[PDB]
Symmetry: D2
Subunit: 264 residues, 4 copies
């Protein structure tokens, strides 16, 4: 191991299965030395999270639905009693109504708008606020975003609006926690075939488009994103805060399909 | 007049008093020949909107609170019956808790976050759903935003997060409706002394900082924002959509305190 | 007309023929009341600029090649003698080796890099140096840029690097001259079939890609860019400076193929 | 050792002294296992580079002035004979007339504009041209930029125009070389007291301003930039290209001084 998180203790929310971006981050951080606490969303997720948590010599700290303030408080109560401190926090939580991830953005329902904003955006602020006084000087908070916050990606619709709000909240949070040297950053990941991302209409097309048009000519993996997360969670990135870090084979820099790019 | 909106018909939501940005927009648009309709938020706002509408020979189409879906349906039904089609729409509505626009972003309540996102962001999508039906022949939709959507500005907090979502929704809406040639744009205005803008704490300092450090060495007025709105509402800008247009004396371009 | 430039006088550099973006700017500005002066780049351009200037009752103030500082001085002397003051200036000048607007950016030549940077970027600062003396009462300076400054557009290559420097210089000039109320802005135009743009490798493809995928589902014209330029040159935009303004049917906002 | 650059060979251009950003990058890359080669710009620089190179078990591969294309090809000939392949390249080179890093950008001279663009921008493209054949199995190319490319920083002037071109060239190069898995990125560094940066007018004001107004309430060090560079030069960042990575204590995210942040008074 590289020892980059030796003796560090961190909390990961959003582990769903062994395809989760959160699982890539967990494997990498654990190999780097971190002891990891995991939450789970509802009893079903629990049976899948438990053997994964055992595999990284971490542990399951409890149920957390981020719309449930009491479940947030309980999780951080557990951490406080068990560790008395928290070195880093990974926010890998996102939700939007899969039915409305298609057609036109203008046709979304209000309930989908409110639910998407609350689960995908406010939850990072709620978690950071509850975590602030537990967090060590020099700590690191990490969330995940997508290029659809910057440019219009079809079928991503209200989630793009939500991710633009998430990236802005990262900057405001970074200013709030900066004097405590707690950094707040986001990885803008390229598309990866996960449970939640499968709900996007025509996701197969989006993957191939990235494979054909991204500079590196391939899509990224949870292990690659995990290594980039390790950098932002470790002291290697101690002067980096408020940053949207693209881990996407360079896709975000292209302004047009290559004329000789193959047709999908 | 310059005739840039001659014969055009537009709906303005968000006129509150004679210092509103919406009032600068209304005055310029009327002088350019537009027929204007106005909503009002509640009975106390109605008392101020009626004489201002009279001054520009516009008309008041009724009460609209954007948290009340039925009232949105009602004012758009009124406009549809009177005019049939709409040429432009101005969305000058924003709201956030005044007491939390001071102190730390991280300290905001969930209720304030959700209310701000709904009134300041969702409302544009809610209104555009209805307006699209009246703009089959094309049109222009305009909202208002602020540099705190791009960079951290003191005391703007959750409104900065909300305006970042608003600017993104402008681009998603512009993609939705572009094939119908309905354009959707935003003006990123500099700070101006209005009623809503007075709630932001330390506002006097924000104004002076812009006055002393913006390239043009002065803050902007509702009449200047009105003239930029006129461009975006008129056919002059017929190839512009999804744009966030800074009308801020250039403040958004500086990276540090000006030299003098 | 709309009168937006009534009583105003401006200088336009970069008119090549009746397809130039500068020609759309000229026609619109003339219809809005502006008195216009034009330069030309050499004898071949002169044969078209002179009668075109006549069609908008404009003034031909002479030859200007922005690589030739003496010729810049002479046109501004000519302007100063005739007018005294200048209300606005249009910089519609760009150049690169068309043979290298293809293949890989990394294969460009050093001489092409330097020539492109000089003609396409430094020229705006050089022209602004002289316009400043004539713009004591304020004014508006406009240049033209392209989305290839922000994101990679294939075959645009060193012109993309150049336009990124241009957009930055617009902002630094805006800080310099803003206290004198001289505004400096750029229009980021969508692709248009002009003499200069036609040398871009696979330019037809870039046009069609924009036609099929821009929000408005069409490319833009010199008359549409001219109307946006009118706004930025007129007092309607008197609180706008340092701005990069997209006139491109919304193309710059998309992140993937349209559906 | 963390071993993140175990067995890797890299070339570093731009080491001037023990305060250079390139020195921080070199110390970190060497600690992580890298075998390093250094150029020097002239004889006065050579006197400082040779002992610094020895300190990191590095090796000096000769004189390079990027306005002299013969010297570029010479050092890449030396590298190709000693090593054959190259894993990473560090471009820590910038220049502009320090007498004009003050007053108004509109008053710059044409020769200063052209010389700044050539040394500070085209040099990255020229170096990458040669490095391409030595990086046939992939690699990582890193340059340094500054937030004055994005927003106006007074007295940075033509250097900000140049850094905007440099950042664009990073993206175009990343597209060119991506298919060969050669990544091209930039670190946007916050201000650091170095030889070159000291030429900026009132650079101490820019430093104090960053200390009070950056989110982390401090300016950055060459060791911190070195650690961020380690990430971009190593396989940990193998899916990252075309990136402008801010290592600036977060300064770039600020849109206005806080109301209660200090108003700096100055004395002569
Ligand atoms: N997969 C991609 O292509 C991609 C690309 C860019 C960004 N991202 C982001 O990565 C993050 C992780 O998603 P993923 O792709 O790994 O998918 P995933 O399905 O593995 O993870 C999403 C997680 O969100 C959790 N979640 C949803 N609503 C919740 C709630 N109310 N309370 C608590 N937890 C809740 C789920 O339990 C799940 O663990 C998301 O923020 C997503 O937007 C993903
Ligand atoms: N004033 C500035 O300095 C400034 C700067 C940048 C952007 N803006 C934006 O300009 C817009 C107009 O603000 P202003 O400065 O003219 O202030 P204002 O006080 O004159 O107008 C705000 C309007 O919002 C309306 N509104 C609020 N909640 C509503 C609801 N639930 N339903 C219906 N209407 C509702 C009010 O009725 C009022 O007319 C806002 O979106 C604001 O964010 C203002
Ligand atoms: N046409 C497009 O698609 C497009 C898109 C974005 C931006 N632009 C920009 O618009 C501007 C005008 O170009 P256009 O498309 O109208 O083409 P054009 O061929 O009509 O005009 C280009 C002009 O540049 C002039 N020029 C070149 N080198 C010169 C020199 N050394 N000295 C003086 N003048 C010189 C030519 O004489 C000509 O008048 C350029 O800056 C171009 O990059 C064009
Ligand atoms: N120091 C800062 O505050 C700061 C901030 C942001 C970015 N940067 C960038 O970091 C890089 C390194 O600068 P530094 O601060 O370490 O300063 P430095 O003085 O330590 O290094 C600058 C180097 O550029 C080299 N150089 C200049 N002209 C050259 C030429 N013609 N040929 C070859 N080499 C040449 C010098 O020999 C020197 O080694 C530069 O690109 C600079 O713009 C510095």
């Amino acid at each position: 191991g590289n020892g980059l998180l030796y003796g560090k203790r961190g909390l990961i929310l959003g582990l769903a299965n062994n395809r989760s971006i959160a699982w890539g981050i967990a494997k990498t951080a654990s190999s780097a030395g971190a002891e990891l606490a995991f939450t789970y969303q509802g009893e079903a997720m629990k049976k899948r999270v438990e053997p994964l948590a055992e595999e990284v010599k971490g542990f399951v700290c409890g149920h957390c639905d981020v719309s449930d303030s009491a479940s947030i408080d309980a999780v951080f109560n557990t951490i406080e009693k068990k560790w008395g401190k928290l070195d880093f926090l990974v926010h890998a939580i996102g939700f939007s109504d899969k039915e409305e991830l298609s057609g036109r953005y203008v046709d979304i329902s209000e309930s989908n708008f409110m639910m998407t904003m609350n689960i995908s955006v406010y939850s990072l602020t709620a978690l950071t606020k509850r975590a602030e006084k537990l967090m060590s000087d020099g700590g690191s908070i990490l969330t995940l975003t997508y290029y659809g916050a910057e440019k219009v990606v079809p079928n991503y619709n209200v989630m793009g609006v939500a991710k633009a709000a998430l990236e802005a909240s990262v900057k405001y949070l970074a200013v709030d926690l900066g004097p405590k040297h707690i950094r707040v950053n986001a990885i803008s990941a390229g598309p990866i075939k996960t449970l939640a991302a499968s709900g996007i209409g025509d996701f197969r097309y989006i993957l191939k488009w990235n494979e054909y048009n991204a500079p590196l000519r391939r899509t990224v993996t949870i292990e690659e994103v995990g290594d980039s997360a390790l950098y932002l969670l470790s002291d290697l990135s101690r002067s980096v805060t408020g940053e949207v870090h693209h881990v996407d084979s360079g896709y975000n820099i292209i302004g047009m399909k290559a004329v000789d790019a193959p047709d999908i």
